[PDB]
Symmetry: C6
Subunit: 269 residues, 6 copies
């Protein structure tokens, strides 16, 4: 189940302070788009109210944003992916001047941010995620019908707005949030593929997503499976390590390589 501890209730105020304190945006190949912080706060309030009506034990089905919120929009006419960078400007989510909040998951003493669970198709990413990682909240998005969908920890979303709402909203409260998968975004990345058979803005997006979680004290594990050649996966994994707080590589059902940025330092395997 998804259980709401006193620790989560005590974080509600802090989560609001974090969201209000820093105005954030996101950019991909178009123009920077602001994130409406209010929506995330509204989601937290709705989750806590429902957790209250229950015995602290919540069902992932009941906490999906489409059910709790009237509108699921986070981003507040239309720009092409091939527009001059000087006409749109460039935005990256700012870093944290203070020391980031540490976590015990996915690794001991890991800083707040994003962890990328990498590997070829059928390498055992989903298996590693649910058996070895054991997340508190499992966001299921753009994945086919599996055994993980019947889990009470599973929260089924449709949009990128919904993913960020659940990730920032619940992650800030202290929950160990995971996403299986981020394929709907990755498989719709438009642009000229750079070195490694993948668009360069992919690495910028991982950093922007990681810093978004670092700023809101979230520890999120994302399954990242982009369309890349069997031999080019090693290069891409190395590049992703330079763009995320955590990185896990899967091969033949087992964990091939690891990287975690902890309070004890950067740890490689």
């Amino acid at each position: 189940p998804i259980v709401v501890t006193q620790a989560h209730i005590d974080r509600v105020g802090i989560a609001a302070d974090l969201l209000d304190a820093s105005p954030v945006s996101l950019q991909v190949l178009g123009r920077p788009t602001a994130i409406n912080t209010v929506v995330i706060k509204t989601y937290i309030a709705a989750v806590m109210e429902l957790a209250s009506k229950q015995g602290g034990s919540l069902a992932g089905v009941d906490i999906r944003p489409s059910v709790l919120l009237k509108d699921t929009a986070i981003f507040t006419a239309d720009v092409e992916s091939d527009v001059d960078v000087l006409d749109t400007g460039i935005y990256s989510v700012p870093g944290l001047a203070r020391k980031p909040v540490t976590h015990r998951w996915p690794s001991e003493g890991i800083y707040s941010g994003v962890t990328a669970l990498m590997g070829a198709t059928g390498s055992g990413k989903s298996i590693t995620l649910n058996e070895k990682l054991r997340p508190d909240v499992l966001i299921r998005w753009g994945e086919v019908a599996e055994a993980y969908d019947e889990l009470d920890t599973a929260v089924h979303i449709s949009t990128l707005d919904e993913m960020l709402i659940v990730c920032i909203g619940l992650g800030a409260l202290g929950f160990n949030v995971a996403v299986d998968s981020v394929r709907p975004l990755l498989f719709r990345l438009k642009g000229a593929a750079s070195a490694g058979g993948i668009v360069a803005v992919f690495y910028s997006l991982l950093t922007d997503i990681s810093n978004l979680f670092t700023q809101y004290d979230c520890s999120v594990v994302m399954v990242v499976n982009p369309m890349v050649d069997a031999e080019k996966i090693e290069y891409v994994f190395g590049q992703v390590m330079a763009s995320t707080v955590g990185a896990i590589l899967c091969a033949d059902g087992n964990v091939s390589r690891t990287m975690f940025r902890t309070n004890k330092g950067r740890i490689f395997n």
Copy 2:
């Protein structure tokens, strides 16, 4: 050759209407998420049942084509380019099922509701395997040249993607074993930059979105997917398709080279089961 409507199908009509009304769905490709008008599918089911009633249960595939039964065949309800910022359009994937999906005996025993993808190079024996080994109840024929399968009473000739989804969701929800030969009109018009495997990445997302659309409406559909891909990259593309569908079949030299089915007994790779 005929399409027979059992009491089991008649009893599913209400259930199907509820499934459609219960969840609002959309679809996206490289542009803006587009809503699916559920009403049209319900209207199609009502028209099929009414005609099944006039005839003696038994129906001809020719008579159940949407262009004949419905005044308008539109399912999707100004114009966006395939190269527009992903943040200005947002991203949509059809949501998964929180409950256990309805199991089926076709195309494999104890299979979950969703989509099965019948892969293979040209002349690998996809259409042969589909009609001889699989034996579907309803055969949707789309963007295929004149073959023996067109003279079959199970054959329903469509022209649009809207029509394909109407027949697939409409009849599939009622319990019919629906098949699509081919899905090529869609595949050959996929605009975008080709990813690893000489095919657009959104192709795999579309298969998952189509699979979940059928999982939500308790459909068991087999779609024959013919990719414009090099002889050596077909193995990679299949491996990728397996991770995007409830069922996958590879064809090579008139036979079935590889299979994958997500059953109630678990995920089965290359089983000892004749189709």
Copy 3:
């Protein structure tokens, strides 16, 4: 000459019925465009009236649509080849539920549809067509001045609309229509080249053209010459076999391979 028999005159009514019975469209990389059936009927009536001015014998020059019709348009603001496929929709010309009408040309018992005469430049396609196939009507499009242009069977067109008018119009009446060449269309096909150095929509167009002829009981032979590498022609020919009712490959002035879908079944060489 192009001789009009009583058999052709008796088909006029049936041709009009076939055209009115089914509304058709066509699509390439843009949006589906409807085919104005009326124009084809008007062309048939004009050919029959001229046939009547002569002794049933017609000169190919006199039956060109630009001469017989006030407007040659068949397709009834502007869409790019890289627009969302969900905004335009997808269209394929529907198949025939009934048995297709059989023909004696280009092969015995062949079903109505299209035959693709393939081969490298100077492989003998035009020679094979005019000497071995010997068509009743020879549509000449996008080909330089040759001996075939002085033939009374030759009808010189300029547009794709004109090609379909003569192909559907005369083909429905029972004439053995041939197109040399379909290069104006092929060489202007915009889009990213798929496996085999050719746009994938090329194979969809051949199927849509074939089914358009199957629906109107036409037996047409089109010279399909692709800008493809000398060794990649075998792959493309195999791909075309899956998209047409007939397929003929030319090499060194001789017929290399054949494929025909007949009443006796699919025949390979």
Copy 4:
């Protein structure tokens, strides 16, 4: 060096006007078909004859340039190169149903149309043209300052409209017109390169240009030098032979291969 107007040229003026008025023509590349204003070519012929009358018939190439004789040099009366082929339509200039008028230049008994003077850079194309071919009128387009520019046969143009005006205008009258070179058109041909490292519409354009000259009884030699690999030139030359009435290949200052479509048939070397 001078351009002399014979009685034979004066007697062709009426016929030339009759050929231009008889058939309405257009041209297409990757966009939409654009009509050719025939009147402008007639106006040019009348201006050349009027000047030939004032002088002794001995005209200077400098004095017969369209920019000097005509107030407006436009022959064609905004669409992207990546637009749906069904929204623009397809156009190819129609073939001649009658036998084409034969010429003694560039080869004996050659049919009216276009001849492509091919070869690598510095293979001796310009040398072969002026020394071995000896053209009556030498159109100079997109070429650096050479000895051929000081010639009284040289007519310096700037636009494609001007090229067609001088080619059709003077060529119809019986003059042996040559173009060195067609490089500004070829190097501005936008689109995805097909087999041989060159856009497929290049071969369609050569056929459309050839048929335009076949219809107006012109015998034109165009030096065609597209950006192609040193070893891929043999493939491209073979493909061009299937798209033109004449084809000449240059290597090490000499003529490597030749192809001409004559009244005695197609002659290869």
Copy 5:
């Protein structure tokens, strides 16, 4: 860790304002040339000096971020595509200096004003070399994940390209040793057809335009440049970057592989 304002910096304030007003500048990429609003940089300098006055000259990088000091962070003053005719937009390159550039002691002795590119593969030791071996006065952090360098009092966290240029031109002109870790948010968003070396040609033009912008405002800036390039193609790109920057440093296996600096004693290669 702190950012100290010397009398030398205070004496440069007037000169900096003169340099900015004297020459109107612009920037171009694949679109149309866009003017740089000089006033914003002057306003930033005034805000930094006023805060340095309230403190004891000792400033925290966090307090000097433009988003905190300025109401509006825009430097560039409807929308053009990256594939538009070059003749319809025109071409702009920031002009060179007719006079001798103002030399510095950092990143190398007697190096002319401009930009230095800190190159290398991912995890080659660029960030390590920057903070340990280079020791910058001001460390601009942009498009980089949470690291130890973010807790430094020299660290100034930006979000936009406008902010980067404000801090680089503003503080660099006063004489500060400014560094950017990194410029990945601009590089990874560079739209266009990749030229020889698996990278867009306008990348080299941008480095020269950025270099000259610093040369004109007597700025000594070190930018870590890490574009998506193949493991073996990095040598070619580094050689090409040397022809586009005043300084160039290559990193390999945590150490400095190669160097290039344009100094008063001449161009020095390793």
Copy 6:
């Protein structure tokens, strides 16, 4: 210094004449754009007045167009580089019917036009330019801070308009003008790369620039260093020789190959 001789003063009238006599344009992948000749004349007049105020000895800094002219625009809504060639038309600057004016620089008896100083990065182009070629006026564009910027011959420009103003303006008067570099124009050439890893319109632009100088009796040396592979430079230099009046190849700090079109003929090394 930049010294103004009586020979330069005597050319002022001839320069205005040459400029008024022929209206010119320029085209790249868009539409042809006219060059305002008046601006070049205005620049010449401002340079001569300043030369007359000073001792004839000028400073490159004082003759920059941005300082002498109120507006630096030469070209007089927005077209994409992928637009139909038939909708924009094609323009090439016309050739000279008369003999081009000869020069003693960069080679003896060389015709007026452009010389391309080619080579890989650090091949010695800028060293060869300033030590071996010794230009009168040195235009500095798109280059980092070097020793050449402190020179009194150096004139710092920002736009393509400014480059043409100084090149045509001072070049017509008899000055030996050089551009280091033309990289801001080369590196911003949008379009599909042809054979040799470079856009085909690059060669057309060199010919158009050369002919622009041939028409205005200029002798200009431009260092041309486009992004091309280390082994593909030989092919490109070969194509450039067919597009310019002069061509110099640099390697290992010295001159590898040369080509000059002189009054004594074309000289190769």
